[PDB]
Amino acid sequence: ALFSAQSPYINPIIPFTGPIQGGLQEGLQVTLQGTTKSFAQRFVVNFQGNDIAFHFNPRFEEGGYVVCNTKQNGQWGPEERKMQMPFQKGMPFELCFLVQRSEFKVMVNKKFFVQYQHRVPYHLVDTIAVSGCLKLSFITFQTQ
Amino acid sequence: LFSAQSPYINPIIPFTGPIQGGLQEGLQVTLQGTTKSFAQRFVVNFQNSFNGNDIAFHFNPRFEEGGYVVCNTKQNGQWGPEERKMQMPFQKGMPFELCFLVQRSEFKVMVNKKFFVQYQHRVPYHLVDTIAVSGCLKLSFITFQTQ
Numbered sequence: 568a569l570f571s572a573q574s575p576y577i578n579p580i581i582p583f584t585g586p587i588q589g590g591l592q593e594g595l596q597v598t599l600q601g602t603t604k605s606f607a608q609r610f611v612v613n614f615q616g617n618d619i620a621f622h623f624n625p626r627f628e629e630g631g632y633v634v635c636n637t638k639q640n641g642q643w644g645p646e647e648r649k650m651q652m653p654f655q656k657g658m659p660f661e662l663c664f665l666v667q668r669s670e671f672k673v674m675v676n677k678k679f680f681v682q683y684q685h686r687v688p689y690h691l692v693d694t695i696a697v698s699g700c701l702k703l704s705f706i707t708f709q710t711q
Numbered sequence: 712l713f714s715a716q717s718p719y720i721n722p723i724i725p726f727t728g729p730i731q732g733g734l735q736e737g738l739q740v741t742l743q744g745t746t747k748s749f750a751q752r753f754v755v756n757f758q759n760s761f762n763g764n765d766i767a768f769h770f771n772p773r774f775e776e777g778g779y780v781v782c783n784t785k786q787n788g789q790w791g792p793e794e795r796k797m798q799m800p801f802q803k804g805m806p807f808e809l810c811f812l813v814q815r816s817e818f819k820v821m822v823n824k825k826f827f828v829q830y831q832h833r834v835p836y837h838l839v840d841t842i843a844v845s846g847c848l849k850l851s852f853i854t855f856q857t858q
């Protein structure tokens with residue numbers, strides 16, 4: 568049973584940048600409903616001026632895969648690549664990030680896709696940022 | 712840290728050997744060895760001999776394309792989606808300490824005393840009673856410690 572603390576962002580214009588009230592919290596669920604463009608190459612979801620705690624980057628290249636990473640001081644860390652594309656060009660998607668004690672859990676269309684353990688603490692993240700070849704219907708914030 | 716199994720000393724690669732009482736929560740499997748200096752890739756397979764062919768955890772460092780490690784599972788002769796760590800913690804031609812710490816929800820992998828990668832269980836871990844090692848390396852020993 569999930570309750571919303573923060574009001575959702577409805578039909579945000581891509582590229583979008585918006586604050587997460589009170590910052591990330593344990594148990595917080597961030598759901599993105601939207602659509603992948605028909606000729607999509609890439610899109611980006613960043614939890615983060617220039618320091619990305621968690622970089623979520625699907626790529627319609629080399630068979631289809633998703634990059635998870637962290638930017639610290641303008642430097643990308645080692646990549647954790649999941650060699651499978653859970654999205655589809657032209658098709659709507661549900662993307663769910665769950666903030667757990669030691670990892671983000673990532674769900675795509677109600678099925679687990681990947682986890683990424685925190686390299687920097689989640690508490691210091693107070694900004695979601697979305698860009699690339701997609702449109703969004705909404706972004707929700709829910710904490711049980 | 713106690714020996715639930717007596718160490719394999721200088722096992723010849725390719726290697727295949729039983730793990731005593733299968734994988735358990737808190738078990739550390741250490742591979743002390745050296746990577747060849749002309750090394751393409753090498754394999755550490757944790758597997759179940761009751762479906763031989765299958766591989767529960769496939770750990771495969773590849774000295775290619777900048778150097779990365781592949782972690783995967785093989786079920787019914789099929790490979791699942793790969794989890795690639797894009798970083799090579801083994802130096803070509805050099806010695807290494809490779810630790811596999813079995814935990815409730817994942818394998819924890821340590822290289823040269825540094826945490827390297829994790830791998831969440833895709834098939835139940837209790838099924839693994841075999842460790843297999845192959846490719847461009849040589850092994851000094853394989854120890855077994857319980858945490």
Ligand SMILES: CC(=O)N[C@@H]1[C@@H](O[C@@H]2O[C@H](CO)[C@H](O)[C@H](O)[C@H]2O)[C@@H](O)[C@H](CO)O[C@H]1O
Pocket residue numbers: 622624634636643644646
């Ligand atoms: C294809 C490309 O332009 N660069 C590749 C790198 O991709 C960058 O990865 C970071 C996150 O790690 C971020 O997504 C950035 O927007 C990408 O350009 C990278 O995957 C590697 C180098 O580490 O290969 C580059 O070709």
Ligand SMILES: CC(=O)N[C@@H]1[C@@H](O[C@@H]2O[C@H](CO)[C@H](O)[C@H](O)[C@H]2O)[C@@H](O)[C@H](CO)O[C@H]1O
Pocket residue numbers: 630650769771781783790793
């Ligand atoms: C590199 C190669 O020869 N084949 C590529 C696949 O690699 C296989 O991967 C499995 C484990 O997932 C295992 O290591 C086997 O020995 C490899 O042949 C695979 O990495 C890619 C798909 O991303 O396609 C093959 O070309």
